[PDB]
Amino acid sequence: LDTFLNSFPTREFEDDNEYYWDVIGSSRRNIPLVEARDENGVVVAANAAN
Amino acid sequence: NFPRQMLPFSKKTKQWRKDCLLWANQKNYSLVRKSVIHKKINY
C-alpha cells in the first residue's frame, strides 16, 4: 500500500483550508429550439407547410 | 523513504539512483532558516 502510494507526487500547499482547482468545458455550443413562427406570428406545427 | 545509501558501488544501479531523484519530488524544515513565506513577505 505504501509502494502504491509512492507512485504519486506531493504538492506542498500553503494553508490547511480546503483547496480548489478550476475545471472548464468548451466554448462552442449548439442551442436547442423551443418553437418557431412564420412572419404573421403564428407558430409552425408539425403538420404544416413549408 | 529514502533508498539505502550504505551499499557497495556495484549495487548503486540505475533504478537505485532513479529512486533517489523520484524521492525528492515526494517530500521544508531547517533549524536555522526562516520559512519561505516569511522571506517572501520580506521581498
Side-chain angles (χ1 to χ4, degrees):
Chain A
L1 207 156
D2 207 341
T3 67
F4 171 71
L5 282 169
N6 283 354
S7 162
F8 302 116
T10 295
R11 168 152 176 156
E12 302 183 335
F13 284 68
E14 292 294 83
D15 294 330
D16 44 25
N17 299 62
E18 67 170 61
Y19 43 92
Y20 298 90
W21 60 90
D22 275 19
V23 310
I24 193 172
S26 177
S27 301
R28 319 183 71 175
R29 205 176 66 154
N30 41 9
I31 305 306
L33 197 70
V34 304
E35 68 160 26
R37 285 91 64 88
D38 53 80
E39 48 181 348
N40 287 300
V42 63
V43 310
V44 55
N47 50 70
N50 297 4
Chain B
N1 290 317
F2 195 60
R4 264 192 75 216
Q5 312 303 287
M6 189 202 175
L7 283 172
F9 73 104
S10 42
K11 275 170 57 67
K12 290 179 175 167
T13 182
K14 277 82 54 187
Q15 211 69 27
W16 176 91
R17 309 153 172 197
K18 198 151 143 176
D19 280 15
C20 301
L21 272 172
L22 201 67
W23 176 88
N25 216 356
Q26 304 170 29
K27 182 261 177 184
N28 71 305
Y29 198 65
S30 175
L31 301 169
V32 290
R33 315 181 75 210
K34 297 284 196 163
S35 88
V36 158
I37 319 100
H38 185 75
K39 313 174 209 160
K40 196 203 170 189
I41 283 169
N42 281 9
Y43 277 124

